Structures are given as C-alpha cells and as structure tokens.
Scaffold this active site. Structure first.
Site, PDB file in Angstrom:
ATOM      1  N   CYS A  57       0.790  -1.286   0.114  1.00 29.40           N
ATOM      2  CA  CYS A  57       0.083   0.423   0.365  1.00 29.40           C
ATOM      3  C   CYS A  57       0.867   1.554  -0.013  1.00 29.40           C
ATOM      4  CB  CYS A  57      -1.135   0.188   1.546  1.00 29.40           C
ATOM      5  SG  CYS A  57      -0.096  -0.221   2.371  1.00 29.40           S
ATOM      6  N   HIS A  81      -2.260   1.560   7.503  1.00 30.75           N
ATOM      7  CA  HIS A  81      -2.416   1.321   5.990  1.00 30.75           C
ATOM      8  C   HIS A  81      -2.107   2.679   5.721  1.00 30.75           C
ATOM      9  CE1 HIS A  81      -4.332   0.563   1.773  1.00 30.75           C
ATOM     10  NE2 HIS A  81      -5.605   0.973   3.131  1.00 30.75           N
ATOM     11  N   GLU A 110     -19.883  11.271  16.656  1.00 29.41           N
ATOM     12  CA  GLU A 110     -19.516   9.987  16.457  1.00 29.41           C
ATOM     13  C   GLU A 110     -21.201   9.355  16.880  1.00 29.41           C
ATOM     14  OE1 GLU A 110     -18.079   7.236  19.011  1.00 29.41           O
ATOM     15  OE2 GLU A 110     -16.696   6.689  17.893  1.00 29.41           O
ATOM     16  N   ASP A 158      -8.285   5.624  -2.323  1.00 30.37           N
ATOM     17  CA  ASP A 158      -6.835   4.742  -1.475  1.00 30.37           C
ATOM     18  C   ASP A 158      -6.818   3.294  -2.879  1.00 30.37           C
ATOM     19  OD1 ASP A 158      -5.402   2.526   0.190  1.00 30.37           O
ATOM     20  OD2 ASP A 158      -7.083   2.475   1.684  1.00 30.37           O
ATOM     21  N   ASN A 191     -14.057   3.396  11.097  1.00 26.67           N
ATOM     22  CA  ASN A 191     -14.805   3.200  12.395  1.00 26.67           C
ATOM     23  C   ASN A 191     -15.277   2.677  13.306  1.00 26.67           C
ATOM     24  OD1 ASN A 191     -15.431   7.285  12.990  1.00 26.67           O
ATOM     25  ND2 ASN A 191     -15.318   6.274  10.880  1.00 26.67           N
ATOM     26  N   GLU A 195     -14.577  10.255  20.127  1.00 24.74           N
ATOM     27  CA  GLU A 195     -14.754   8.604  20.533  1.00 24.74           C
ATOM     28  C   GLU A 195     -15.770   8.824  21.898  1.00 24.74           C
ATOM     29  OE1 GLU A 195     -14.568   5.472  22.538  1.00 24.74           O
ATOM     30  OE2 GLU A 195     -13.718   6.533  24.380  1.00 24.74           O
ATOM     31  N   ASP A 216     -15.705  -1.732  15.001  1.00 27.79           N
ATOM     32  CA  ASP A 216     -15.308  -1.877  16.625  1.00 27.79           C
ATOM     33  C   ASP A 216     -15.230  -3.386  16.058  1.00 27.79           C
ATOM     34  OD1 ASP A 216     -16.594   0.601  17.302  1.00 27.79           O
ATOM     35  OD2 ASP A 216     -18.978  -1.101  17.526  1.00 27.79           O
TER      36      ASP A 216
HETATM   37 CA    CA Z   1     -15.780   2.842  16.078  1.00 31.44          CA
END
Ligand code: CA
Ligand code: CA
EC number: 2.3.2.13
Lengths: 705, 716
Positions: free
Chosen positions: B305, B364, B481, B387, B427, B476, B429
């Site tokens: 990358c 990345h 958010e 990207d 973002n 966060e 989890d």
């Molecule tokens: Ca998150």
C-alpha cells in the site's frame, strides 16, 4: 510464499467447493434426506420455482420449505442435537453468510434462518426450514450435522440435495418484494418479451425469448457471477447483483458475455439483429467460456433481463425514443449551422439515437433516503461515466425523475439520456458562434415497456420525467445541476412557425414529405429553407446525405403555406443501413430578421415480416410441424440467408441457412417441434442475409396438456 | 455490407499522444494573396524566465513550455510584415488528441481580446514592434490538462491559413493550485509548497506506539515523469474531456495504480518472497517505477500500500493536484462497509485461531487529494481520500474514492465515491465472541476504540508527523460520533449486531525492542469492584505480516491472579529473543492477545497490542563540494546486524535532483560485515536535498537510511 494480504482467499465462486469433514455410534446417523422437490409438489409450486427445467430443489429466500430427515433410530430431544447446514464456495465462513448452520427452533422467526420440527414419525423428522430473506442467492450444498460429546458427525457430500436459493418477490421482507401478483407473473415469471424499436412516429415491435426457465440458464447465471469473480457475500444484495451482472454483459477483451458491434457487416460473428433471444447466447457463452459475437443495445438488454428474472429480481426492458447516449452528463446537444441556414455537417457530430433500450430492476434501496425504491434503471450498453466507458446504474428512476442524481449509481448519465436539449448554433465564417434557438422536447420524447396484459406497449414516460414546461420539471433540473448534471450554455433564448411531416413507407416504395409554415406576423418574409436527408444507423450516426433540396419561400402576413416533395425509392434504395433508418433536417433562414427555424424527424422503412405456420396437434409431449415462411420482396437476390426459429417451452433456438433467394421468391423451413410447456406460447423467427436483415416474424400458439 | 462506424460519428478522443493533421490551408467555396504570414513563434519558455517562474513550473526537467491553467503567460509572434489591426484577423489555437472538437474543449481557438476576462480563454496584444506582436494569453481555469499542440491561424474571406505542426511549441497545461478560480486552488503558499512543489516525502509505518518513518522520492519534476503521467491516462483510455476534472483524474488515475492482469502500473504482492520482481520494501521512490512502467509498457513488480500511495502521490503532484499520503494505525481494510470485526474465543477464554480469520492492519497508507466537490452539497471540498489499494466495494475488487474526508467524518457516506468503505476503515469496532462446542455463539464485549486509533501525515515545515485523526473522526464516545454513525447507517454503512453490552478491566503494555533483543510485556488488571475475584488469563503472541495476518504463535503463557477489592495487580512477562528470532516476516511485526476469564462472573476481558522490532538503519555519508553541476561522492554503508549471512543483498540509492535511482547487488554479506558503496553524484537542483537508501536481501529487508544535504547554487 506467505498469504500476507489476507488469511483466507476471497470466496468468489459458487462453482468452487471445500470438502467438509464427516467427523470433525449410539449417536444419530442419517440414513436418508427427502426434499420433496418434484415440480408438482408443495415446495416448488409454492416457491414459484416449478417452471425451472432442473431436477434439484429450488426455493426462494425468506420463505419456509419442507424437508424430511430419516435417522438410524428415532430422534429424541432429550439426548440428540442435530442441525441442517447450507454451505457455498471454497471458503465458507459463518460470519460471511456462506456457512449457514440452521438451528432447530420451536417456532420460526421472521428474518432468521431456522428449522422447526413439524412432525416426528418413527425414525423420521419433518422440518419446516425458513431461510433469511437477506440470504445469499446461489446454489448451496446441504449437510446434516450431529453434535456429540466427542465431536460433530456430518453427512457426506451429496449433489442430489444441492439447493438453489433465489430472490423472492413474493416475500414481504425481501428487498425485491413486489406486492402485485399480476406484476410478479409478468416481471418474474413471463419468459417471453416484446422489444420496441423503429422511431417515435412508427413504433415497431419484435418478440424476444428470455428463456430463464430453460435448461442450463440458472447455472449460466451463476457462472456469469463466478466469471465476474463476484464475492459470494454480495450475491444476496440485488443492487450489487444488478451492478456487477450488468457490467458482465458488455465484453471488454475476452471478459464478458457479448461483444458489441455497430458496424453493419459483423464479419466473424452473428449480426445483432439475428438473435431471437437470450438462450443460445447464454449457453454459447457458457460452453465456449468466451464472449459471444455480436450484440447491440436490445440484445444486451434482452440477455440482462433474462439474468435478472432467472435469479428472481423483477425486471423489464424499456425503450426510450430519441435517446442521448454519450451525454457525459451534459444536457445540451449541438447542431451547427452555416450562415445561410444549412446544417454544417463537418461540425454537427453528436447524434440522437432514434431509440435506445435499457433495463429496469425492482428493489428497495436501503442505501438511499426513503422513497427511492421501485424500478432502478440499469443500462449495460456502455457510455462514458464518472469512471470510464462502462455500464450505468442501478439508478433509481424516482431519483432521476426528481433530479436527485447524487444518489448512486450513474444517475446524472441516465438523467441526461432523457432530458437533454438540442441547441441550434450558427458557426459564422469569422469563427464565432451564435445561439439560434433551443429544442427542449425532442429528447426523451416517449419511453415505453411491454404491458402486463399482453403484447401492447405501456407509456412510462412520466415515470422518468415530470410535465415538460412545468414546475416539478424545473425543480428537478435545478436540483440535478447541483449534483453532477451540466447545462453550461445558458439559454437566455420572428413569429413564424415551421414544422414538417414525413410519411412512413414500406421498404422499396416512394414516400412524401411536406413542410408547413405559419406566419403569425403582419409583415411579409422571404425565407430560404433547406431539406437534408440522410441514411443513418439506428443510433443517429449518418452514413450519407441521400437527398438535399432548397426551397425559396415568401410568406404573406397571417398566412399558412405547405410545400410538398416526393422522395423516390431510387434515391435511397441501394444505400440503406440495417434497420432502414432515415433522418431529416428542415432548417431555414428568414432573410428580413436573420431568424433560424429548425426541425428534425426520423423515419424507418417498413421491413417485411416472416410468416410462421403450424400443422398438427399442439400438446406437451407431442409432435407439431412448424413452417417458417419468408418471401423476398426486393428486386435483388438475397445471399447467405440465415433463418432463426425460437420459442421457449416449444423449441430450442435453431438456425437454417439458404444460399440465395432470387427476387420475389419464397423459402419455407419445416421443423418438427415437441413442446415441453403447456399453455399460451409463441413461435419466433428472424432472418439475416448479407444485405437485408432486421427481419422478424412470430406466431402465438396454444399448447395442451 | 459496409464497415461503418455506427456506434457514434467520432471515435472517443482518449489519447493525448494521438494527433490529427490540421490543414495549413483550408479554403471553401470559391477562391475567385498575401494575408499575414507567421515567420516564427517565441514562447519565452526558458526555466529562468517569468512564464515558468510565475507559473511555478520551473522545477520540471523539461525544455517545453509548461504553464498552469487559469493564468496568463506571454508569447511573441513574428509575422512576415507588420500586424495591421485595421484588417488582419488571426488567433492562437491549442489542440489535443486525434479528434479535437471545439464543443468538447479539445480544439481551442484563442481570440484576440482588448482585455483578458476572468475564467475565459483570450489573448491580449501587449506589445507591437516591427513585424512582431507580444501576446498575454490567458487559459480557462477549467481547461483540460495535458500537452497541447499550438498553432497560429489567419482568417481570410475564403477560409483559414495556419502554421504547420511544430513540436517545439507544444505546451503543457496543468492544474493550478495558485489560481483562485481553479477547482484545485489552495489559498496559502506554505500548503502549496508542501503539497505540490515538495518532491520528497515521508511515509509513517510501524505501529501506533512505535511510529517509524522513512523518506520517499516523489520525483515529480524528474525527466520523463510528466510524460509518464499523461501516458498513464492514455493507457487508461481516459477521455480527454475528463482530464481537466481533478475528481475524475483522481478516480481514473488511482484505478491504474494497482495492476489487474497486464493493465496498470504495479503488481501488488504480499507474499514475503517476491520471486521474479523487486520487493515492495526495496523501492526508494516513484521515479524508477514510473519510468520502468513507461519503457516496458507493462506492470512493475511489486507493490504494497505505501508503494501504491507513493506512486499515486507523484502522479497527483506532477499534474498539479495537491496531494499527501496518510497512514491510519489499526486499519480495517476488506471491511465490506461493515463496522464489526470478530475475534472468536474458545469457551475457556483463549482465542480460537481457527475461526479468527479477519485481521486489522498495523497501519495502512492511502492518499488525500485537494479539490472542490461541485458534485456534492457545499462543505465537502478540501481533502478527498483516495485509496488505490483495492478492497471489495460496491462494484468489486477496486480502488476506493475520491471520498470527501468531511463527508466521511459526518457520516454522509451516500456521496460518491466509496465513502462507506473508507468510513468503516477507521470506525469499525472489534467484537469478541465465544464460539461454544454446541455451535452457538455468545457476544462477550466490544472494543470501539482500537480501529482508526491514529491517522497521521507528513508535517508542512519538516519531517515530523501531524495528527489528523480529528479530520476523519469526531471524539470517541460522544454525540457527534453517534450522529455521524446514525447517519452513515442510513447510507450503506452496516453494523448489524446489536450490542446490549455492559467492574474489572485490563490493559497491557509491550516494550519496543531492537531486533535481536529481549523485551518485556506488563499486564495490568484493575478491580474497581468491592468483590474479590479470581482470574485465568492467557497470552498468545504471534508473528504477523504488517496487515495483521498471523503466521505462527511464537509464545503462549497462561496464569492465574486473585484480585482484591478496589485495587490494581500487575503481571510481567519476559520475551526472550530466542522465542521470536528466525521466525520474523518482513517488517518484523508481532501481535499480542491478552484474554482473561473472571471465574466468579464468567465475564471476559480481552486486549490486543502490536509491536515491530526496530531494524538497523543504512548509513549515508558525503564529501566533496556540494554545488549544482559539481561532483560529490556519496558513501552508502550497510552493516549486517544478524548472526546469519545475508544473500543477494540489493542496496538502492536515490535522491531527486542529486541522483537518478540506482542499485547495486552484493552476493553475500557475513555476520557483522559492512559493505560500502561509493557513487559520484553531480546534483542538478540546489537547496535542501536528501539522499535516501534501502537494503533488501533474500531474508532481511525493510531497511532504510537517509541524509539531508545542502546543495549550493554556482556563480558569483
Ligand atoms: Ca468505533
Ligand atoms: Ca429537455
């Protein structure tokens, strides 16, 4: 070498499989599995999959189906734990939706995989299995697994229980839900279509075999997706299915289904006009494993419509009359003029398609604001879009109608296809340009699709476009211009009306054209008007000016004058392209005021039809004799005349060549057919020679038993 | 029968290298003759003169005229007699491609005008002398970008007379970050200098707690690179009418970076071996990659990358779109726009490594390109994420973007291109799930803070890092958010698993270590409860690739702890060199899971960390005068730190304006041996420069060094 990019390779082929372990004897073992999968039984009848010519179970997702498992001894809930499994691809994984453990439940729950034991008799258990209505669409492997203290015992690979799970327009929870039985029958279960062609004032119609229930087509549709390397996890999303599958229709460099060709000769291939449907194309794609030659827009749309209906996404083919393809999201097309009022043919290079076909596919759009589901336009005939020369869509037809062309995919392009203006511009000898007037009503003039009833056409113009001239249309264009539509040339835009009318004629006959002028002023005008008539391709691309004429008109105050000319058959007859399309410009300069008047019209000559006849008894399982008749009405001899016969449920697609046909001569082709499908059916034919092509014929038949 | 072009009247105009023939004479009608005749044309295109200096194009190693769109430049036309405004009509023309048309922007007649107009092509006569006119020509700020042919044309009553093809007046027109009406306008010189004119970059790698840096030659001003960028667009068949749109140049350009089959610039490979090509880690910059792509006309092997990002960054800055490389620490790539990545556990609390198959990248890299977005609502201009390392998006396995970073931040991910994927990249989890022996699964807890923990890019004044995490993500555990998440889920983001969810918590810390050294890990358990608990904890330590993909577990420990009420307890673990040495992959990444079951409540604690061993640096030294045009000797030294002998050692040397990329092989280097490579360089650029080096062998690689050097100008 290390697999460092990802721990498991993409699971992107339905054809590929893993080998599951059987061990991973007082415990349950399965002695037999029964899927009740005959075509007259409950499962396929109720899943509306009984038409497929396929002996495997085929269900629709989100809906329960019945299976029976026979065990070594009677299942006992106090000591036994088993589940059915459904597996797809070489790399199945539960969190990707490709290994599916179906839990025994007391009651089925909406939205979830589950299996309820509905009966227990001796060593048998009957289950009602409900699939998720979000389920991946494809052909799955079924297993039964038995959980012991020592491990999982599992049935061995068995191709007889392989089960196809398809999209389900009858299931309220499915993205593809369509709440009208008449519509589901037409847009999912009808396997015969009608395509509209010709030109807006002379709408021609031809029949097309979708053929989605025919042998091998479902498997070919899965193959298309595998050849796209379509990730198995996106195959339960009807949006991505439409997105990827339509990208496979046009072949770039040995990689999709149909090679595009608009060259009127089609040297090492079949002409686009010869195809009678999607079946022989798809199966030749699959057997050869390489693109099929050749298609144009209605052929791409035919084949794609088969793909969608076969997988269970409700779909229809649309014809737009006067279509700006190649728009690049710009909403102005230019016609340039010389200072005397003639069309400038060096500069006028952008053409309007007389018609263009694309597809519509029914689905919710949970990626967009509420209100944008329903039909989604998908055009697999490439045009330049934001990314390159590619298919366009799925674009929400509601979003297009309202100008909300920020929502994916490629909405600005389909928007410009049906909403562009024509701009008449004089190119002056000093190199400057002057904008003369604008035509806002020509493009996207009529949009039609097959009616539900039968073969009539349904006018669906207002699903794409609000009323010309009015406020909703103005609002839609204003919003569109915010989101990628372009209409740069601002058209801050005497008292003479000009129109003209062209008669429709049979191939080989003369026809009349007359031009009308209305002077609503109180003063007199001298006008010079120019008639320019071209041989064109159905795309509008002009091959040659076959007729040109100048008219010196004086117009009295408050007057109406009509002028007429005869076009003779010999002015066009050796020069026609396939589809026999003609284009007419009438342009004129008013000498007193230097105003420009301008008008365009398209005509197609009427091509003679094939006659189809039948003798004998018309019964599933019984022989009938079909005769295909063609009479050459031309004064030349037609060479290498390939005739095609089709009709799903009645015959495989077949073709027959005749080396020549002397002028005014008839040929006849007899084939014994033995129908496999009962009821209202249709026989369908086409003819292509080295000159005359775009010849069709059909015959409705009724089959018994 | 015909052989006709029935798809469209004119073939797509999609190659800058193809050309039409413009008539030198085109008369129509009825000729029944000395109109103005051109004798020569002067573009004042020398690199010290005002056209290139004021257009900020003097750094290009290219003797043709190069200007930026939207801005005036001077030319002089010498005619055979004196221009006579009473009756002469002439103009400049700029033409591009084999099928130029005025209404597509590819035939451009430049009219003589009394005054230049904002936003329009025009030419003003500023001097008349003898048989010459001096023109100030202004291009539209919307102009197609590319290399144009220039003509002068003279209008007669019967038609036009026109200069003949002259390659000496071919003029590149590029994007213009200094022009306030250009879509790529950037409003201050400090950012223009960093994001357009700096041809040296810094790439951040390693892991969040151990950020590693190396330099990269963008090299956008080196000989051949501009023409290569135009060639890229021709190999993509990019319609010339889209090449003045920075959104579509970014869209199409980034799709060329990753080679699928024989098309594209670079073959991606993550296999640790790179047989039959050059390891991604060996490259020092974009220049040797681009020129090999151009001369071979085939993909260059191989990239990962940051190598795609380096090349794409070159392509953007060379055309004039401001651009920069960003690194995201703990990156969820292959997310499918899903915001939940799973870790499966055994029932005792260990990680189930058979089912745990998704990996988070330690880092990345991708690019940001600066432009307005007139396709979206107001507010979404500025940086656009692009990207070029493919992942599965709504169309298939492809590059993603340009996606507005502002739209990603606010969750407006309906707006093109591929925003949900970039959104899930930062973002997502983590979800820890027990997979039970009966086949059922139970959600134990969720880590919402691990992914997208830090996003960084090179600083404007220097090589330091700027934290731009705030540009992608609101605070966060707060409302902005939450709203952004709520909005994203309406527009293609997916987070299907409801987390009902939540006494004792746990974290751990790992010392950073030099390759070949021992290091420690220390686990802290905090019991905030009034209860005493007992716990069984597990440590699993894995050798991984930088993508997170694990190769093997090198260390496994379990232990029991009792936690008193209202206290902390620490457990320290020593990792000896011998436990990892000899098993490392390139970049030397290690990954640690610490999971634990609380006995009395059956709650599960889980935590992850990565580390990379610090790899020794190459040494660069210099002697000799450091002056443009004079010779200086560069010395490159590499000492083998290992106790094994390295084999087939390639050392690369680079430094834009100082040397072209070069490399030298050493068949074997023995334990502790030092190899030395001296190169006589003669710089061509003065100012603050850099010499950069990499080393790659059949085992050890991902080894770099550099040296800042001040090059003086010459005379007096
Ligand atoms: Ca998150
Ligand atoms: Ca209109």
């Amino acid at each position: 070498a290390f697999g460092g990019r990802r721990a498991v390779p993409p699971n992107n082929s339905n054809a590929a499989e893993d080998d599951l372990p059987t061990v991973e004897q007082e415990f349950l073992n399965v002695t037999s599995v029964h899927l009740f999968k005959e075509r007259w039984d409950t499962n396929k009848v109720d899943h509306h999959t009984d038409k497929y010519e396929n002996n495997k179970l085929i269900v629709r997702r989100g809906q329960s189906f019945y299976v029976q498992i026979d065990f070594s001894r009677p299942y006992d809930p106090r000591r036994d734990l088993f589940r059915v499994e459904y597996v797809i691809g070489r790399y199945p994984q539960e969190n990707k939706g490709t290994y599916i453990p179906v839990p025994i439940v007391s009651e089925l729950q909406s939205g979830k995989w589950g299996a309820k034991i509905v009966m227990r008799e001796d060593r048998s258990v009957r289950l009602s299995i409900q699939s998720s209505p979000k389920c991946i669409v494809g052909k799955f492997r079924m297993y039964v697994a038995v959980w012991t203290p020592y491990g999982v015992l599992r049935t061995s690979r068995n191709p007889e229980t392989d089960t196809y799970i398809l999209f389900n327009p009858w299931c309220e929870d499915d993205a593809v839900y369509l709440d009208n039985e008449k519509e589901r029958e037409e847009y999912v279960l009808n396997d015969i279509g009608v395509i509209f062609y010709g030109e807006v004032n002379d709408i021609k119609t031809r029949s097309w075999s979708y053929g989605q229930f025919e042998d091998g087509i479902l498997d070919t549709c899965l193959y298309v997706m595998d050849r796209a390397q379509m990730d198995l996890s996106g195959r339960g999303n009807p949006i991505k299915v439409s997105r990827v599958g339509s990208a496979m229709v046009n072949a770039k460099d040995d990689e999709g289904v149909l090679v595009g060709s608009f060259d009127n000769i089609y040297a090492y291939g079949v002409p686009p006009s010869a195809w009678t449907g999607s079946v022989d194309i798809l199966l030749e794609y699959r057997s050869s494993e390489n693109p099929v030659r050749y298609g144009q827009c209605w052929v791409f749309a035919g084949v794609f419509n088969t793909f969608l209906r076969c997988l269970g996404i409700p779909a229809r083919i649309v014809t737009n009359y006067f279509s700006a393809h190649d728009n690049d999201a710009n909403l102005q097309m230019d016609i340039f003029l010389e200072e005397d009022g003639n069309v400038n043919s060096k500069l006028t290079k952008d053409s309007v398609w007389n018609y263009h076909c694309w597809n519509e596919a029914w689905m919710t759009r949970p990626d967009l604001p509420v209100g944008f589901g329903g039909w989604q336009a998908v055009d697999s005939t490439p045009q330049e879009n934001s990314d390159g020369m590619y298919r366009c869509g799925p674009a929400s037809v509601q979003a297009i109608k309202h100008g909300h062309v920020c929502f994916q995919f490629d909405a600005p392009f389909v928007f410009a296809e049906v909403n562009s203006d024509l701009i008449y511009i004089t190119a002056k000898k000093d190199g400057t340009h002057v904008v003369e007037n604008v035509d806002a009503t020509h493009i996207g003039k009529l949009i039609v699709t097959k009616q539900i009833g039968g073969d009539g056409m349904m006018d669906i113009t207002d699903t794409y476009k609000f009323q010309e001239g009015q406020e909703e249309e103005r609002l839609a264009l204003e919003t569109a211009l915010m989101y990628g539509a372009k209409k740069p040339l601002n058209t801050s835009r005497s008292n003479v009306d000009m129109d003209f009318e062209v008669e429709n004629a049979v191939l080989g006959k003369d026809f009349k054209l007359s031009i009308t002028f209305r002077n609503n002023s109180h003063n007199r005008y001298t006008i010079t008007a120019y008639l320019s008539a071209n041989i064109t391709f159905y795309t509008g691309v002009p091959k040659a000016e076959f007729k040109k004429e100048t008219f010196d008109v004086t117009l009295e105050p408050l007057s109406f004058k009509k002028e007429a000319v005869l076009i003779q058959a010999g002015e066009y007859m050796g020069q026609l392209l396939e589809q026999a399309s003609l284009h007419f410009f009438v342009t004129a300069r008013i000498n007193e005021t230097r105003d420009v008047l301008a008008k365009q019209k398209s005509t197609v000559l009427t091509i003679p039809e094939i006659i189809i006849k039948v003798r004998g008894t018309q019964v599933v399982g019984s022989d009938m004799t079909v005769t295909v008749q063609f009479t050459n009405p031309l004064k030349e001899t037609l060479r290498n005349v390939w005739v095609h016969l089709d009709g799903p449920g009645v015959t495989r697609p077949m073709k027959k060549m005749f080396r020549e046909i002397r002028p005014n001569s008839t040929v006849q082709w007899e084939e014994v057919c033995r129908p496999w499908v009962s009821g209202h059916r249709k026989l369908i034919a086409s003819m292509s020679s080295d000159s005359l092509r775009h010849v069709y014929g059909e015959l409705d038949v009724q089959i018994q038993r």
